[PDB]
Amino acid sequence: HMSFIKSQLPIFLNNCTQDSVINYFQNSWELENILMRSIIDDETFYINPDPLRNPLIFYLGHSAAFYINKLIRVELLEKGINSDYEILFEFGDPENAEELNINWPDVRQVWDYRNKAYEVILEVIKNTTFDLPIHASHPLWALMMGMEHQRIHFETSSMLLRQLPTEKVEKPQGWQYAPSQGVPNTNKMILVEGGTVTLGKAKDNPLYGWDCEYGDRLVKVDSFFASQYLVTNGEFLEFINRKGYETQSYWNEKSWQWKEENKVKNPKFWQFNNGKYSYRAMFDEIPLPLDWPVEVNYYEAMAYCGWKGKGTRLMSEAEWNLAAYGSNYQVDIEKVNDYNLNLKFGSPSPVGLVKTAQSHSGLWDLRGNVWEWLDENFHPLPGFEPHFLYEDNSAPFFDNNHKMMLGGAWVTQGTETLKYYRNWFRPNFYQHAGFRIVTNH
């Protein structure tokens, strides 16, 4: 599996020494540099490959600016590097390309700002006492935030690069896709015994987390059936061949309108040619990996559920937590090595290939491989409180227009690989995300 490109595991707040944080910081930055350096021509930075997101030049400077602004806010920095850039590269969620649709700086100028910002932050780390443990009311929380924010944008930007033509990107040395064993095994429904789970994260938990992660909610989860694997490309191919995209009964009025307006006939990263479907990995087009989890948005996942019928649905946040972590929990960061997470592979993996990736529930790849959609409107947990460093992180998206996803993907790094991270997206948006199907009986 992908070894030459290595991502350092997250660190508990009680072990965030200066040395370890220096290493984690350097790894966070170098990884984004590798991805950004995969764009061959600088003119390509002014393309917005995703019609719902900004140009790539924005994301070149966004992670660096975020560091500086948060450090300034906690007064670990007395001044920034470029106030204009710190404004331009700050504001990052439209429902249409029209809504989404400024004079951007040159590519060299943004790289220069990145380089200056890196050295500035490194000096802050080398000249600040790391009095253990770090915590939410500690100024260094701003640094923890920036490093996790940079790693999140490694993922979001990977999606942008995937939407660029293959001829405009260059695969980094060591990038390695998972294998394909061909046709997938049978996807059996597994009974997940009912139980009670506690959602949320305590304020004194020794791990960095975003505001929406914190709170406390007990939820009694009734037993339910779930597919042992995420729905595979092969399984979704059947849905297509049975006219899944052409039968309104499987969709709803909102989802059908999306599909028609975007003239969708297949998942975003499939392409039909010569009687066969090709599939777009990060940097190359390859024969469709039939045993990999299918990558779809929420509308498409629900259309598949509609074709399956019989009340087929998606899990709730509580249902996923029960299946993944049970009713018990002390996080063991080393367990991230047991799942397709943290760049073990540079791609999705065949369901069940990572033999260490079966949860005690019997379900495979609940953690890792690809994010999995949930029928759960993004919402606060009892006890939620915005953090002064980033009050608009999650609160504006408690609007019943965002569905959640959990577990992490092959590209996911940092604290986002662990139990408490809560993810969300508009249901039409594409990520490294798939789904599994659920029935109550």
From the list ligand AVI, Fe ion, Na ion, none, partner contacted by residue 372 (C-beta under 5 to 8 A by kind): Na ion
Contact residue for ligand AVI among 18, 46, 92, 382 (CB under 6 A): 92
| Owner of token pair 């790539």 | 56
Kindly state whether residue 332 participates in binding Cl ion, applying the rule CB under 5 A: yes
How does strand 371-377 pair with strand 433-434? parallel
Among 73, 171, 268, 335, binds Cl ion (CB under 5 A): 335
What is the DSSP code string of 190-246? Answer: EEE--EEEEES--TT-SS---GGG---EEEEEPPEEEESSPPBHHHHHHHHHTTGGG
Helices 18-36 & 141-162, crossing angle to 10 degrees?
Answer: 20
Per-position x/- string for 41-80, each x denoting binding to Fe ion as judged by CB under 5 A, each - no binding: ----------------------------------------
CB of 381 to Na ion, least distance (A): 21
Using CB positions, name the residue nearest to Fe ion: 92
Backbone angles phi, psi at 57, to 5 degrees: -60, -35
> Residue 292 or residue 424: which is nearer to ligand AVI going by CB?
424
Bridge partners for 200 per DSSP: none
Under the criterion CB under 5 A, does residue 295 sit at the interface with Na ion? no
From first CA to last CA, the distance across the chain in angstroms is 38
Give the H or E element holding residue 425: strand 423-425
Q: CB of 10: closest distance to Cl ion in angstroms?
A: 11
Instruction: Write down the least CB distance from residue 46 to Fe ion, Å.
Output: 19
Binds Fe ion by CB under 5 A, chosen from 6, 15, 92, 254: 92
> In whole angstroms, what is the distance from residue 162 CA to residue 50 CA?
10
Residue from 117, 152, 197, 353 binding ligand AVI (CB under 6 A): 152
Of 4-43, which residues contact Fe ion (CB under 5 A)?
none
**Count of residues interacting with Na ion (CB under 5 A):** 3
CB 348 within 8 A of CB 292: yes
Say whether 402 counts as a known binding-site residue: no
What is the closest distance, in whole angstroms, from the C-beta atom of residue 149 to Fe ion in the complex?
A: 6
Task: Give the pair of three-digit tokens for residue 331.
Answer: 């996080």
Q: Which does 407 bind (CB under 5 to 8 A by kind): Na ion, Fe ion, Cl ion, none?
A: Na ion
Show the site string, 313-352: x = touches ligand AVI by CB under 6 A, - = not: ----------------------------------------
Please identify, using beta-carbon distances, which residue of 281 and 354 lies nearer to Na ion.
354
Q: Applying CB under 5 A, does 300 fall inside the site for Na ion?
A: no
Q: Is 360 annotated as a binding residue?
A: no
331 counts as binding Cl ion under rule CB under 5 A = yes
Tell me 103's DSSP state: -
Residue 333's nearest CA partner among 16, 67, 33 is: 16
- CA dist., res. 294 & res. 226, Å (int): 16
Q: DSSP letters along 131-142, please?
A: -SSP-TTSTTHH
Cα angle 299, 305, 309 (rounded to 5 degrees) comes to 140
Tokens encoding 239 = 């849905």
Q: Which residue number, 149 or 367, has a Cβ lying nearer to ligand AVI?
A: 149
| Look-up of token digits 């253990």 | 132
Structure tokens given for 354: 């990572």
Q: Mark residues 114-153: x for contact with Cl ion by CB under 5 A, - for none.
A: ----------------------------------------
Closest approach, Cβ 179 to Cl ion, in A, equals 27
Cβ neighbours for 342, distance < 8 A, ≥ 6 positions apart: 7, 9, 336, 412, 413, 417
| Residue 92 interface partner, choices Fe ion, Na ion, Cl ion, none, CB cut-off 5-8 Å depending on type | Fe ion
Q: Which two tokens stand for residue 181?
A: 């064993």
Contact range with Na ion by CB under 5 A, out of 17-25, 113-121, 235-243, 401-409: 401-409
Q: With CB under 5 A as the contact rule, which of the stretches 208-216, 265-273, 349-357, 370-378 interacts with Na ion?
A: 370-378
Query: Is residue 15 classed as helix, strand or coil in its secondary structure?
Result: helix
Indicate whether 324 belongs to the interface with Cl ion (CB under 5 A). Answer: no
Minimum distance, C-beta of residue 432 to Cl ion, in the bound complex (Å): 21
In the three-class reduction of DSSP (H, G, I as helix; E, B as strand; rest coil), residue 21 is classed as helix
Pairing of β 217-221 and β 195-199 = antiparallel
Retrieve residue 137's tokens. Answer: 């009311």
Residues 231-290 that bind ligand AVI (CB under 6 A): none
Of residues 300, 372, 375, 376, which one binds Na ion by CB under 5 A?
Answer: 372
What residues form the annotated binding site for Fe(3+)? 62, 149, 153
Contacts with Cl ion, residue ranges (CB under 5 A):
331-332, 335
Contacts with Na ion, residue ranges (CB under 5 A):
365, 372, 407
Contacts with ligand AVI, residue ranges (CB under 6 A):
92, 149, 152-153, 156, 423-425
Contacts with Fe ion, residue ranges (CB under 5 A):
92
